Amino acid sequence: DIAGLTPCKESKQFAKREKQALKKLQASLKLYADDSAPALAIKATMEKTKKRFDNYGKYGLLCGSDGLPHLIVSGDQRHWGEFITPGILFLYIAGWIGWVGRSYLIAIRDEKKPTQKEIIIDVPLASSLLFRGFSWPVAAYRELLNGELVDNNF
Amino acid sequence: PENLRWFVQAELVNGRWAMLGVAGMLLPEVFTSIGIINVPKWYAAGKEEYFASSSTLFVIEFILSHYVEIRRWQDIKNPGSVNQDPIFKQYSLPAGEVGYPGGIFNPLNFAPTLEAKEKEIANGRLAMLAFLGFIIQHNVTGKGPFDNLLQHISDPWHNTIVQTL
Amino acid sequence: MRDFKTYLSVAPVLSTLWFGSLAGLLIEINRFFPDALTFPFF
Amino acid sequence: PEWLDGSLPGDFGFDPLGLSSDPESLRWNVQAELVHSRWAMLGAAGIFIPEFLTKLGILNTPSWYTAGEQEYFTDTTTLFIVELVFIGWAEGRRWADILNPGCVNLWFDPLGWGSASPQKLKELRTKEIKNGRLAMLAVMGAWFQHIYTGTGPIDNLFAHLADPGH
Amino acid sequence: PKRGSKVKILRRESYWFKNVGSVVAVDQDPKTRYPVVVRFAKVNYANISTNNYALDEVEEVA
Amino acid sequence: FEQWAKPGHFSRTIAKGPDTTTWIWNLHADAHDFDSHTSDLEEISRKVFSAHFGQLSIIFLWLSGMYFHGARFSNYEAWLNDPTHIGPSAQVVWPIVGQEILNGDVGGGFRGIQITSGFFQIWRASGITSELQLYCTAIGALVFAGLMLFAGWFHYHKAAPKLAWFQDVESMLNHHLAGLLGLGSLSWAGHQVHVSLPINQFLNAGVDPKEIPLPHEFILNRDLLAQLYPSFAEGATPFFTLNWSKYADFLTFRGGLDPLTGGLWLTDIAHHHLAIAILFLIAGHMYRTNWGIGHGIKDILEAHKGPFTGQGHKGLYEILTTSWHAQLSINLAMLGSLTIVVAQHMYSMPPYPYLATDYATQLSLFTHHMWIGGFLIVGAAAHAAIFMVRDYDPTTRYNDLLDRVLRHRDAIISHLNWVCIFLGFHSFGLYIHNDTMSALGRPQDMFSDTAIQLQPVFAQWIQNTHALAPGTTAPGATASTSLTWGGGDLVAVGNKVALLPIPLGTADFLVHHIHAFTIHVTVLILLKGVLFARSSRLIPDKANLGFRFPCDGPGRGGTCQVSAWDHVFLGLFWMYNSISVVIFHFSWKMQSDVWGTINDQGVVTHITAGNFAQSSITINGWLRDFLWAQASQVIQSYGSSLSAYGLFFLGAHFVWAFSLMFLFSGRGYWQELIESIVWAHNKLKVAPATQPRALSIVQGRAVGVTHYLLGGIATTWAFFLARIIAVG
Amino acid sequence: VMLAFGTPEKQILIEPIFAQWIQSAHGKTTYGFDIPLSSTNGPALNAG
Ligand SMILES: CC1=C(/C=C/C(C)=C/C=C/C(C)=C\C=C\C=C(C)\C=C\C=C(C)\C=C\C2=C(C)CCCC2(C)C)C(C)(C)CCC1
């Protein structure tokens, strides 16, 4: 409800330009609609869509003039998450690749002699080398801030 | 294995706050009966009182909390600590943190500390499996039953995600 | 089999191979929850 | 600079190292293979053969309904969750016995010998009683359906052309 | 005493440099500036590497 | 055996106890090549047809698709029956994230992406008919790859194979002619007469669908074809001794084309493919072999001399026998236009039925079928180099015709260099004028048709004569050898037009003199850098850096781009500027001034105007009216099925773009860089050991070449496309 | 992508939330968002 941008439910545009945009693919009477492939340009799909119409709805995004999702989190109201509730994971999903990324490498001086010892990967991964990826920060993310860094290692 | 006697207490602390944590909503736990996602508070009460919201039960009872917890912290740090239950030892006889302050930089070892029975420890973690049952339902299926000879292992119904909420 | 181990690698198409036979899954998920638009927590 | 030369087997060219192949399988624990391949379908040596029977169920087929518990979508797809977690922990840590523990990197004895090795007729006891059974789950291999969307292997069946005609 | 140890490189000349260990060999032949023979396992824009050294340098730890 | 890598391969110093990234494109950038292999033929001849292998096993691996993905989902049937309106389609695509609309739904009961490049027209040409059919030829050719790829293993491997009887060169050069053309040409006639001819002649009206005379018929017993074009079919073929005249009926030089749908006659293609068939069967015995009949191999060439041009053209090489590289220009320049020849030929005078009228392949095809050609020749004689700097051994030559050039360099190249001003510089410097003379330059007086005219004119030429050519003069054939040339004797069909008298003039001795130009200063680049290349009059000694070899001196005050490898590194760009020109001129003739439509009162009506004539004189006229007058197609063109060409040249413009970044850029600048970052990994211990160095000079005159040169292509194929179809 | 593949409905256009604050306090009174100052009676826009 903030800055504009209305929650979709007053429908004005979006919902209609929608029930327009998608719905002249629908005028695909211009073929023969029964069973097809070769055609189904009409009947289905709209299932994902129109039979997801008033569905999408539904949490607002306060989709806005034009009548489309102006997608915003910034840390106000329910939204504090339309990208943050799915905004952290990414952080999470990446830099523990860094762990594998690190400990894969930080092995590539152990057992001794290295590099292409980088090309032949010694199938490097599946558990703790990754499956620590699971559990890094605020329990041990300060794998950073002691003996591994510094750095302090040799 | 994994690592060194780093946190014990941290997770111990956790397991301390744990059982009586899962004792907390363990009132909704229903002696026999009185539950749901909660609002109230032990019994009674009726002074003047413990209140809302230009008051909150929060900041009053939980500012002062701070010095009650920092004492431990700095107590850990500069040991510091009883004689000695929690950091660490006197009686009798838990799972040993075992080590002393340093390594070869770190590893002159690191973990020969297993051994025994069922024992003391255990229940500390029990309540976090409790939790990962007890949290998961309560917004997914917000009441806790158990029911034999009736329709356990039969069911009845269904209930998924998108309904709505 | 072992042991972490190591284990044994292979040559030039592993970082690659990763794209396909596993990474695809994505499009399954992206099918499974058709599109995303934004956050579905459970 | 080893060796390499040697490196190998240590040279080359041109032959018998031999260890040898390549071009098929297989050196280390090509026995995890062994130890996996017996069990996996010795297991199966008891799914379809019960089946390959039931068609013939002389006088009455089977019957069992429940006597357990009966309501709103009741019983068995729940399910493998319980059933094949139980037999889950079964599979796993019987056969971490390709060696096995970490050779890769209380007491001791029992039994007497070397996996009470053998005996040297019982090595033969396991033999192709172990293998010929996976010769015969090659019958499995070749569908293991016989219902080839095949109608067909009914009215039960199965077989049985011999081959009549007309 | 340190013949080819984990010893450093330290002069506004080099390529690798801070990069540590290795004095491999050291001569006894005086003239030059180049007594300190270094070989690691990391390389400049040659491939053979190892070029030589000495004097206003080894400002290092163990 | 053997094998396998691992470090080190062929670039001697490959393993190097590594040290740096940038080996992974020294190997990816050596790998095939030789001398950085060996000319030791007993292991290089036995690579080239090893090959040469897969390429086919790949070509097979190819074609075996273009029928499975024809005959697993037709537009073939669901159209064939009805050419005309309702047209091509060979791919329909899974329902992921909005793929869909990419498979249109516009083809006669078919959802699917529409298709440019005959095929429908290639297989309605023979006949085949039935999806379960050239699907019965999808399997014909896929293992059928197999065995041909089962030749890798055939010889070489268990069979280190033979240069002794590779070197020689007479059986094969005779047999290709006979041998494996000659299994062909005419043994496509047996096909082109019996299979092909009438399952077309009787297609040419009735025979709508399903009862489709499965080729199965017409062997052992005749009667039917007999019931058709006769020949008297007893068991005695006249022309065994000169009743030729009769078994004719259905093959007198018909020329023109089938006005009941363009193409041009199959009644006009056995006489073409049993004559040019057998010359190649006979004329594919003229050389030695064993049985005492034949010619010189080379013994012919030193046959003749001439005073200057001395020795003549004499004793013609002995690696020309041996191996590839030496040879390797000629099979390309040749094959070269042998894909600009068939081009300027195909559209030029239609094969398989359903072209002339078509478009989206009396263009489309036309191109590519000119890229491959341009591409091919305009990178053919980077094989003249290598060779000198390579496969050429000690001696064989001096007084050779060869050397007669290498001496006469500097003053052979040179006298092109000037044409390559005049021809161009000023003959392109010539739209320019008429811009300065249309903007500034008032029709009053300047270079266009009712302008620097040139009244009748330009003729015609000839061509025209090409139109008195069949009415006498080459007695007959039929109808004017190709409607494109001639007078006003004019056809078409299918409402829209087909080919007509495409008349030239101003707009015609213009443009042209650009292809006429270009293919001057696009060779000599080429010749300059093909002659000097090993001896260059200004680093004189080259074979001292390799084939590629970057530049050299910051000295002599600016020695770079010396290599032919880099004479080739821009050898191309222009081609693209030249092939990726010329296409253009084409697609605004075909159209605007050839394609049609129909209405009626004497009036053909083209895709665009008889514009062109005087609004493609001036340079500009090709953005006024060749862009923003077009592109509309692609500019808007989203939410649709033009929904790829609104999606390609996007990330085709970028990736014309993301060239210059690697191509205008520095190289030391970049290496200089990949520390800095380095500090992050390292100090924080991550960092490689394949020391991540920054891409090797040549290597990035090996990307803004590819990338530029991927970029402005798709783009124009993202573009030219979607123009054609709806205003197509 | 979408905008091409009939799908503008779904779309990643995340609308600026920040500059946003400015341009109102610095005066601008154009729709929504019940905060102070430009309130067209507000206590940074007062005292002055
Ligand atoms: C970050 C990220 C990403 C991104 C991506 C992107 C965004 C891209 C784009 C890019 C761009 C921005 C552009 C590009 C484009 C492409 C292209 C462009 C291709 C091509 C091609 C081809 C292969 C072709 C060929 C051809 C021929 C045959 C001839 C004629 C023409 C043509 C072209 C057709 C990814 C996903 C990776 C992953 C994750 C993250």
Ligand SMILES: CC1=C(/C=C/C(C)=C/C=C\C(C)=C/C=C/C=C(C)/C=C/C=C(C)/C=C/C2=C(C)CCCC2(C)C)C(C)(C)CCC1
């Ligand atoms: C408090 C505050 C804030 C902040 C601000 C800022 C912006 C500041 C500055 C600050 C500082 C003072 C900073 C610094 C930082 C640092 C860093 C450093 C970051 C990061 C990082 C990184 C780079 C990482 C890495 C890693 C890790 C660590 C983990 C994962 C993996 C890896 C290894 C990759 C805010 C916003 C709320 C506002 C108010 C106040």
Ligand SMILES: CC1=C(C/C=C(\C)CCC[C@H](C)CCC[C@@H](C)CCCC(C)C)C(=O)c2ccccc2C1=O
């Ligand atoms: C950018 C640039 C480089 C540096 C470019 C390099 C080193 C190419 C990068 C190679 C690839 C892309 C490695 C990057 C990582 C990838 C292998 C894959 C990771 C990314 C995802 C797909 C997972 C040059 O060397 C150069 C040389 C001469 C003139 C201009 C330039 C120039 O412009």
